[PDB]
Amino acid sequence: DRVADVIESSIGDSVSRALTHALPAPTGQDTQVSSHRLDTGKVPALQAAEIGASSNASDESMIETRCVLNSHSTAETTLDSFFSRAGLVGEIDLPLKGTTNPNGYANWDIDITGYAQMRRKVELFTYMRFDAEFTFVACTPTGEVVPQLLQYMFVPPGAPKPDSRESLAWQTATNPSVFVKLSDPPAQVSVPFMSPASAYQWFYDGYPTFGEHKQEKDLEYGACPNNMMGTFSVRTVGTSKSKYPLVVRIYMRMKHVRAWIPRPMRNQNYLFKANPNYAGNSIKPTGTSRTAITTL
């Protein structure tokens, strides 16, 4: 390197320059004693919101305050305190006579977007990285517990999915499987982080395949292959048909949680899984309304 453009160059600097840093903060900030002020040139109240930053005025600048020692804890607003609570994420029905799953087996694609209460919580951020904990509660349509043997198999993507109650894929020589009774307490296991990326993403702005994107290939927009973790399969262990109808409910609880890049929370009703679609005719405001702005 001889020319004095390469020596002085900043190309190749891989270190991130951070303007800010994190500080310990176990409790809320205290309030100190302040008195009256009568001066020119110091205006804590006057701000400029066009800059794009929040107001830096404090309690002591605007009014006269007293000394208060704040010991309120901030430990309930962390991510593990907010997300490590189990919620319903799926439901599987195994009826005797019906059209959905009459043959005694069912397949469920692993997804979180099926129910609104957990979907709205998880869609506050763009990227998320966590471990899981799945609990399976099984019973009859009326809630009664009956003697029966069940099998749950986890099928990673690419593995052959069972096609019948007596399929050869139920030998589970490689895939993990669980044998449990309906008289036992609900089964629960642990799940790692399996994404090929560094974090799950709930919003993907793009197409997964190359080539022209026509109108008959529009169902591929927004589909991220890195979130497709496989299939959950269930059957009644036997050769003949079972005697009772069954219902299975799945609850999942996160742990070891990290999150990035917050975004506005959902405003309208949900319509489809993995789709931000909303009802065009009925758009409702975020909150309530009143008759006049000058009254209550």
Partner 1 sequence: ETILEVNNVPTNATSLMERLRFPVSAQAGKGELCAVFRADPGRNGPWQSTLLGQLCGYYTQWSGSLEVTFMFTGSFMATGKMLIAYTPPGGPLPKDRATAMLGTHVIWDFGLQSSVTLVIPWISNTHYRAHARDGVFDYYTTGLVSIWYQTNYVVPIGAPNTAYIIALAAAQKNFTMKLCKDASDILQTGTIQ
Partner 2 sequence: SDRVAQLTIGNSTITTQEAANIIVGYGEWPSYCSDSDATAVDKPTRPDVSVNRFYTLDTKLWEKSSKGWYWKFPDVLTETGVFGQNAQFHYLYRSGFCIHVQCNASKFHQGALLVAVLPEYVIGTVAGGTGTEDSHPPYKQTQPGADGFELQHPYVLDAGIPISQLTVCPHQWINLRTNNCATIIVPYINALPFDSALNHCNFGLLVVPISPLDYDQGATPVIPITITLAPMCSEFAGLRQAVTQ
State which residue, 146 or 199, has the beta carbon closest to ligand SPH: 199
Piece of the chain touching its own copies by CB under 8 A; list 8-16, 36-44, 101-109, 282-290? 8-16
Q: Which of partner 2, partner 1, its own copies, none does residue 88 bind to, with CB < 5 to 8 Å depending on kind? A: its own copies
The structure tokens 């979130």 sit at 227
The three-state secondary structure class of 266 is: coil
- Say how far apart CA 254 and CA 131 lie, in whole Å: 6
Q: Does 223 bind partner 1 (CB under 8 A)?
A: yes
CB of 160 to its own copies, least distance (A): 15
Q: What gap in Å lies between CA 180 and CA 187, rounded to an integer?
A: 7
For 106, residues 6+ apart whose C-beta sits below 8 A from its C-beta are 92, 93, 94, 100, 233, 234, 235
Interacting residues of 83 by C-beta distance below 8 A, sequence separation 6+: 121, 130, 254, 257
Closest separation in Å from C-beta 151 to ligand SPH: 9
User: Pairing relation of β-strands 125-139 and 105-109?
Assistant: unpaired
Q: Looking up tokens 């290939």, which residue turns up?
A: 217
Which has the closest alpha carbon to 251: 93, 94, 115? 115
Largest distance between two CA atoms of the chain: 91
Q: How far is the CB of 18 from partner 2 (least distance, A)?
A: 6
Assess 254 for contact with ligand SPH (CB under 6 A): no
Interaction mask 171-200, its own copies, x per CB under 8 A: xxxx-x------------------------
CB of 89 to partner 2, least distance (A): 21
For partner 1, the binding residues (CB under 8 A) are 50, 54-55, 57-59, 62-63, 65, 70, 72-74, 76-77, 81-82, 85, 155-160, 168-169, 172-175, 194, 196-198, 208-210, 220, 223, 225-226, 228
For ligand SPH, the binding residues (CB under 6 A) are 110-113, 132, 134, 152, 154, 176, 178, 189, 191, 200, 227, 229, 232
